[PDB]
Structure 1
Amino acid sequence: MDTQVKLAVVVKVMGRTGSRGQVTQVRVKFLDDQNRLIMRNVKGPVREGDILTLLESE
């Protein structure tokens, strides 16, 4: 499953190892057409309000 909407805002890092700088996935919601919860992958820390393109997303 998963649609494909423009952008995506990270709701909050669901955990991982971490401490400072967060290598592993994060749970994201689509910025527009909200309330679709999936796990998309990032390297590095990330904040809510951040804008990143999730082009094909899935």
Structure 2
Amino acid sequence: NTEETTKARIMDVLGKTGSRGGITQVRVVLISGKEEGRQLIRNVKGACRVGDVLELMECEREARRLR
């Protein structure tokens, strides 16, 4: 099991999505070996504040919407 878990933290909590009205969309900042600094807009699920840290198992993403 050789994964590329790049650790990234929450920059800004955008809004809520998925009419399941439970998913959260967040802007991230990275801190890991590979790149770092790169900002992504990822989709979380669950309790999340500003500044937490989340292990992304795929930096090539960033789906998005705001309407």
TM-score of the superposition, structure 2-length normalised?
0.54
- Give the structure with the larger strand fraction: 2
User: How many equivalent pairs are there?
Assistant: 50
Structure with more contact order per residue of length (Cα contacts < 8 Å, sep ≥ 6) = 1
Once superposed, what is the RMSD of the aligned Cα atoms?
2.4
Q: 1:5 to 1:53 in 2, by over 3 A?
A: closer
Look up the match of 1:52. Answer: 54
Q: CA deviation at 1:15?
A: 2.6
Q: Which runs of 5+ in 2 are unaligned?
A: 61-67
Q: 1:49 to 1:13 in 2, by over 3 A?
A: closer
Map Cα deviations across residues 15-49 of structure 1 (whole Å, 9 max, x no partner): 337xxxx6231111112411x22211101231233
For residue 44 of structure 2, the aligned residue among 31, 36, 42 is 42
Look up the match of 1:25. Answer: 25
* Identity percentage of aligned residues: 44
Q: State the 4+ residue runs in structure 1 displaced beyond 2 angstroms.
A: none
